[PDB]
């Protein structure tokens, strides 16, 4: 199910505009594109920063893996970490008008594989990682998002960062 009343923005409460995001390509090895936020979201003096991992796909059957550190995995570094949507990867965020709202990924990209588990654990951000595999044919350009936000975590005088995943799928196979 989706929460039709949910609305957010890419910048969240950081007040940073997109031109000031730190933007990165996903880590890509063969047909596996990975966004590992474990280190990039840890508290730093300058924080909160926005850390945007761009998963740009123009090839078929790409597997995508996102890694959001769990609260408490390290003593104080992820105290207040939040992920969005809570039901990822079954639910994603897509831009409607100018705001982020929930969408069923299976409806958004027909044929997408969402395995129930990941390394025998639930394919949910509460187990620290989510995975899905894109199909061999995408007819229309599609952009969806995941949020892994540690910007409300304070350690020392340091503050965590807001992580954004943007999956930009170009048409292919047609």
């Amino acid at each position, epitope marked *: 199910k989706i929460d039709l009343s949910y609305e957010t923005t890419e910048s969240g409460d950081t007040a940073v505009s997109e031109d000031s995001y*730190d*933007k990165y390509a996903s*880590q890509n090895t063969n047909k596996e594109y990975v966004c590992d936020f474990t*280190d990039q979201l840890k508290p730093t003096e*300058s924080g909160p920063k926005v*850390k945007k*991992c761009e998963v740009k796909v123009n090839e078929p059957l790409i597997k995508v893996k996102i890694i959001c550190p769990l609260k408490g995995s390290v003593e104080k570094l992820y105290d207040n970490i939040e992920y969005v949507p809570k039901k990822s990867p079954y639910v994603v965020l897509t831009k409607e008008e100018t705001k982020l709202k929930e969408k069923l990924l299976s409806k958004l990209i027909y044929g997408l594989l969402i395995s129930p588990t990941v390394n025998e654990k639930e394919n949910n951000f509460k187990e620290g990682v989510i995975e899905f595999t894109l199909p061999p044919v995408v007819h229309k350009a599609t952009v969806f998002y995941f949020i892994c936000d540690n910007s409300k975590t304070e350690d020392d005088n*340091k503050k965590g960062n807001r992580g954004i995943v943007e999956v930009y799928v170009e048409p292919y196979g047609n």
Partner: single-chain antibody
Framework: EVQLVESGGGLVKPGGSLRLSCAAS????????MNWVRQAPGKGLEWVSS????????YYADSMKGRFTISRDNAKNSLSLQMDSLRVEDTAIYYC???????????????WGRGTLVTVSEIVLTQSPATLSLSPGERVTLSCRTS??????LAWYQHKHGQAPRLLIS???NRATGVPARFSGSGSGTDFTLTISNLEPEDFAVYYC??????????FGQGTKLEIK
């Protein structure tokens, strides 16, 4: 065996402009992230800028944004650094370096040039000791402390005077190709060590650590000066 040769350095007056160029050979330039690193006189290495293979992602050190511009011509196997409104504090040796990655995990600098001298007239790595003098045949351990934990995302470099920096170890414990087994790395989190056994007079050099996981900027240690006597 020199595979990156920087050009366009030299003298420039304050407020002037320079354009450095790096010519690459022996590898496929078009498929690697390229970087600029610099070393002010009496200081350590400092990352300047990075550009991925397809130029989609460009990164700058905050103190150099707006004044320096990186670009690459893949058909000419060349790298460029436009330097404008230069200041006296931009005086340094500028090194061209190849990176072994291009994604959010960051990368290390696995191939370097000897550098060109330019004369104008947040994660902290703390290395120890600052200097030490040893005899050949002996063993030594160098330490690196990071202000934030980086799992095992550290690399170690050897810098002999007037030569190209050399990657010794990456991801904390993995020796680069060609590095003899007497170099070994260990550690994770915030505490890392480089151990050199069977010291040879050639190991008279400065050793730098580097973290790749919390960036930009990539940050180096201040260096450890090893005097073999």
């Amino acid at each position: 065996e020199v595979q990156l040769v920087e050009s366009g350095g030299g003298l420039v007056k304050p407020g002037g402009s320079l354009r450095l160029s790096c010519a690459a050979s022996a590898f496929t330039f078009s498929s690697y992230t390229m970087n600029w690193v610099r070393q002010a006189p009496g200081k350590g290495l400092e990352w300047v800028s990075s550009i991925t293979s397809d130029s989609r992602y460009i990164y700058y050190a905050d103190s150099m944004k707006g004044r320096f511009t990186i670009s690459r011509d893949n058909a000419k196997n060349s790298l460029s650094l436009q330097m404008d409104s230069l200041r006296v504090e931009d005086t340094a040796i500028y090194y061209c370096a190849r990176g072994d990655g291009g994604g959010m995990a960051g990368w290390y600098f696995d191939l370097w040039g000897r550098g060109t001298l330019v004369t104008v007239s947040e994660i902290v790595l703390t290395q120890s000791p600052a200097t030490l003098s040893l005899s050949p045949g002996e063993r030594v351990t160098l330490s690196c402390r990071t202000s934030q934990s980086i799992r095992t995302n550290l690399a170690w470099y050897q810098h002999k005077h007037g030569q190209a920096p050399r990657l010794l170890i990456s991801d904390a414990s993995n020796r680069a190709t060609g590095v003899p087994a007497r170099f070994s790395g260990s550690g994770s989190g915030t505490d890392f060590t480089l151990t050199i056994s069977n010291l040879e007079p050639e190991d008279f050099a400065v050793y730098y650590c580097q973290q790749r996981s919390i960036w930009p900027p990539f940050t180096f240690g201040q260096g450890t000066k090893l005097e073999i006597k």
